[PDB]
């Protein structure tokens, strides 16, 4: 993945744990020969996948609950770090800010010309419910859409309860999620 997100990695990790902690996670890793993540840069999805296995490892936590932490992280890293009009432009609100992620990515990847997004799509069951179509050319991110959708709901104001319905590993087509908002 592109460099932006080990950056996003690095920094949720250093400014919960310390610089220290950061340092032993990313030895772990394997990657203490990287001096810094530069951000516009394309990496192996491999640095990324190690980071979050050595961070469950020296924090003693599920690597569910890292990709969870990091998927809120996100919505909040990206706001601030070069990307906040963006997202604005995406909405004022979970439902439609859903529906707009996909021509939001489009936009991010008219800048990293090797972007390789997800895709989601709503069927929406109702003005507060819906049911959300993950699809991705990656393995294993369900629980990172978990946390981005918490950090979405927190955005928005709004509270959002989700379940996952449909389980990409599991050997179903794709990762399904229903979700009620309020
Ligand atoms: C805030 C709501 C967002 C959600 C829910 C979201 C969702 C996701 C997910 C689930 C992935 C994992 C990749 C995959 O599934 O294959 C991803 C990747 C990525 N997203 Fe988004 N995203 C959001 C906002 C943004 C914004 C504002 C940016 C601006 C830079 C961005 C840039 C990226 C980049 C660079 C990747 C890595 C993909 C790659 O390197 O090929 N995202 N996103």
């Not at 592109?2 to 950056?7: A, P, Q, T």
């Not at 909040?76 to 439609?96: F, V």
């Not at 049911?131 to 369900?142: K, M, V």
């Not at 599991?170 to 399904?176: A, N, Q, R, V, Y």
Request: charged content about 25%; overall charge negative.
């Amino acid at each position: 993945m592109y460099g932006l997100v080990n950056k996003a990695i690095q920094d949720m990790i250093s400014k919960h744990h310390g610089e220290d902690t950061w340092e032993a996670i990313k030895q772990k890793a394997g990657l203490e020969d990287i001096d810094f993540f530069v951000g516009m840069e394309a990496y192996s999805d491999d640095v990324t996948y190690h980071l979050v296995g050595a961070a469950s490892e020296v924090l003693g936590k599920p690597a569910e609950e890292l990709w969870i932490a990091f998927g809120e992280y996100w919505v909040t890293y990206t706001s601030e770090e070069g990307y906040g009009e963006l997202l604005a432009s995406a909405g004022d609100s979970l439902p439609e800010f859903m529906e707009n992620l996909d021509n939001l990515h489009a936009r991010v990847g008219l800048s990293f010309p090797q972007l390789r997004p997800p895709a989601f799509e709503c069927q929406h069951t109702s003005s507060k419910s819906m049911e959300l179509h993950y699809q991705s050319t990656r393995c294993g991110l369900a629980p990172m859409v978990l946390g981005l959708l918490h950090g979405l709901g927190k955005r928005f104001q709004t509270k959002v309860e989700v379940t996952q319905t449909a389980f990409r590993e599991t050997g179903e087509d794709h990762d399904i999620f229903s979700i009620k908002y309020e």
